[PDB]
Scaffold this active site. Structure first.
Site, short mmCIF file in Angstrom:
data_model
loop_
_atom_site.label_atom_id
_atom_site.label_comp_id
_atom_site.label_asym_id
_atom_site.label_seq_id
_atom_site.Cartn_x
_atom_site.Cartn_y
_atom_site.Cartn_z
N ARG C 128 0.86 -1.19 0.00
CA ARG C 128 0.00 0.00 0.00
C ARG C 128 0.90 1.24 0.00
O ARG C 128 1.69 1.43 0.92
CB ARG C 128 -0.94 -0.02 1.21
N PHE C 133 2.08 10.68 1.32
CA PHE C 133 1.51 10.15 2.55
C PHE C 133 2.47 9.12 3.17
O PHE C 133 3.25 9.47 4.06
CB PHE C 133 0.14 9.52 2.28
N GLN C 136 3.58 1.49 2.95
CA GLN C 136 3.29 0.48 3.99
C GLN C 136 3.72 -0.92 3.51
O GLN C 136 3.44 -1.33 2.38
CB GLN C 136 1.80 0.48 4.34
N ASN C 166 -1.58 -0.51 12.25
CA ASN C 166 -2.38 -1.25 13.24
C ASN C 166 -3.85 -1.25 12.83
O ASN C 166 -4.22 -0.64 11.83
CB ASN C 166 -2.21 -0.64 14.63
N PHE C 177 4.89 1.45 8.33
CA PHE C 177 4.96 2.39 7.20
C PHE C 177 6.12 3.36 7.35
O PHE C 177 6.61 3.60 8.46
CB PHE C 177 3.64 3.17 7.06
N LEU C 186 -1.93 11.25 12.45
CA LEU C 186 -1.73 9.90 12.99
C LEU C 186 -1.13 9.90 14.41
O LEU C 186 -1.00 8.84 15.04
CB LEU C 186 -0.82 9.08 12.07
N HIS C 190 -0.70 5.85 16.00
CA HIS C 190 0.33 4.90 15.54
C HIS C 190 1.65 5.17 16.26
O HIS C 190 2.02 6.33 16.48
CB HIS C 190 0.52 5.00 14.02
#
Lengths: 213, 78, 229
Positions: C128, C133, C136, C166, C177, C186, C190
């Site tokens: 991903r 951004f 991952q 998660n 990531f 985030l 995270h």
């Protein structure tokens, strides 16, 4: 079998170079090339004890034993021959250097080059002949770009500009070696030697424009 | 954790290969995979209710290992 | 006065010539010992020149006199005297190495780089990737999103930070990531646990394979990984 009895028994032989000469030579020749390092230590001790007797015979016995114990060739054999050439470097006769470099010429590793070239530099004293023979024969044989460069630097220190320009011309042949150096330039350096010829030496105003051209 | 949200699917997948698919991990007690009526096709995201929560937390750990039609499958708690 | 006559300089190389091409056939003692060349982190493409080392000095000098103005690849080349990692492959092409500085969260990621607990990241993908951004991965034997496992059991100020993926509070496994911008939304959701120290350019090559929906345009694989120790 165990060469230790050959080293101790070779050291126990009395008299001059006889029992150890034939008994040690045949003993080391009939065995495996392993203890031969200890045979070189016993050759240094025997050469040191026999150093007070004449010149030739001890050097021929130790050199013959070291060369016979090395079989055909080896890595340390030209090193030991270079050591005998170092002790024999000051002699007064060219036979020790001729047999020296001749024994060191069996193989062609990086070793023995610094034995051969400074030998031609020292022999080059008082006569141009060995410098031109060993320089022309060394630069035109084997393989190396740097051999003709070091021989050209040693030839430029003499009173003759021929061998220097002859080596710079042989390296200036290029043909199958345009960039014989990469970053190292044997041409612009020879052109700098031509600039040294452009120094206030010849005032005839002739070779200056020919050297610049 | 009893339920999970599952994204990124192809409509040839249906509620059955989800049934079979996630019970490979652990049994899906309640399946929900919307059928869209208007154009009669699936957007490809899912909700799963399990027996209890332990099933589904192991499911968080293992679960994101299903690849539907060569493509990636989202599984997260809910 | 110096003895650095082993490293030879090769110029006028082709776009296809690399440390490999020079090794099996360079100027002096290139393919031997060690070779140096201009390699990127994502592009990983040599320019045209490089430096080859020879086991000895004599061998190097002989290689120059020869390779000098030689003919390679229908061209005339010149020769003359001169914390954990992941190696990334994008499509069929090596991209380069990312080096990362990393207690329980750091130890988990460290072990997954070394494979010392019997499983880890080697050969897994970045499944991903979203431009501007994050990238991952860590779904080792999953290639989905939050798939994998920790060494313990099942369970953001700028670019180049490592953070745990998660599926809610207290659900850390192996998925992680690498940030591609400040991702402060985030924070507190995270667990950030490390940073890229070398190869931010390789992370940018991974990001280049991203899409808005996170689907990689080309496969991004952790070809190798381990620890500096």
């Amino acid at each position: 079998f165990s060469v230790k009895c050959w080293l101790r028994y070779i050291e126990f032989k009395q008299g001059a170079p006889k029992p150890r000469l034939n008994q040690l030579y045949e003993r080391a020749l009939k065995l495996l090339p392993c203890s031969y390092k200890l045979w070189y230590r016993y050759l240094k001790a025997r050469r040191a004890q026999v150093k007070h007797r004449c010149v030739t015979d001890p050097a021929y016995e130790d050199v013959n034993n070291c060369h016979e114990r090395a079989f055909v060739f080896m890595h340390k054999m030209p090193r030991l021959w270079l050591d005998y050439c170092q002790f024999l470097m000051d002699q007064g006769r060219v036979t020790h250097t001729r047999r020296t470099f001749d024994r060191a010429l069996r193989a062609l590793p990086i070793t023995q080059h610094s034995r051969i070239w400074p030998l031609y530099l020292r022999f080059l004293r008082s006569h141009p002949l060995p410098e031109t023979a060993v320089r022309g024969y060394r630069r035109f044989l084997k393989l190396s770009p740097e051999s003709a460069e070091e021989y050209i630097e040693y030839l430029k220190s003499s009173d003759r500009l021929d061998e220097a320009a002859q080596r710079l011309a042989t390296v200036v042949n290029d043909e199958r070696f345009v960039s014989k150096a990469g970053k190292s330039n044997y041409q612009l350096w020879h052109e700098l030697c031509d600039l040294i010829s452009q120094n206030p030496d010849k005032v005839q105003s002739l070779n200056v424009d020919a050297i610049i051209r | 954790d009893a339920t999970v949200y599952v994204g990124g699917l192809d409509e040839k997948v249906s509620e059955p290969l989800l049934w079979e698919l996630f019970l490979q991990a652990g049994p899906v007690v309640n399946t929900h995979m919307p059928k869209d009526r208007v154009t009669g096709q699936h957007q490809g995201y899912g909700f799963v209710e399990f027996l209890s929560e332990e099933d589904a937390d192991y499911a968080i750990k293992i679960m994101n290992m299903i690849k539907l039609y060569g493509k990636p499958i989202r599984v997260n708690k809910a | 006065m110096a003895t650095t006559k082993r490293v030879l300089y090769v110029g006028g190389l082709a776009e296809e010539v690399d440390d490999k091409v020079l090794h099996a056939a360079f100027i002096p003692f290139g393919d031997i010992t060690d070779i140096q060349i201009p390699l990127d982190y994502e592009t990983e493409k040599h320019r045209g020149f490089a430096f080859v080392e020879f086991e000895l000095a004599e061998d190097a000098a002989a290689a120059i006199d020869n390779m000098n103005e030689s003919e390679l690849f229908g061209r005339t080349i010149r020769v003359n005297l001169a914390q954990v990692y992941m190696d990334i492959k994008i499509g069929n092409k090596p991209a380069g190495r990312i080096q990362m500085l990393l207690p329980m969260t750091a130890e988990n990621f460290r072990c997954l780089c070394t494979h010392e607990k019997g499983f880890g990241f080697k050969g897994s993908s970045f499944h991903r990737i979203i431009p501007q951004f994050m990238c991952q991965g860590g779904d080792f034997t999953n290639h989905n999103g939050t798939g994998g496992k920790s060494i313990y059991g099942k369970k953001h100020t700028g670019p180049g930070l490592l953070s745990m993926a998660n599926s809610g509070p207290n659900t850390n496994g192996s998925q992680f990531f690498l940030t591609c911008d400040k991702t402060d939304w985030l924070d507190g959701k995270h667990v950030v646990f490390g940073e890229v120290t070398e190869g931010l350019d390789v992370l940018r090559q991974i990001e280049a394979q991203g899409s808005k929906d996170g689907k990689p345009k080309q496969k991004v694989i952790i070809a190798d990984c381990g620890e500096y120790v």
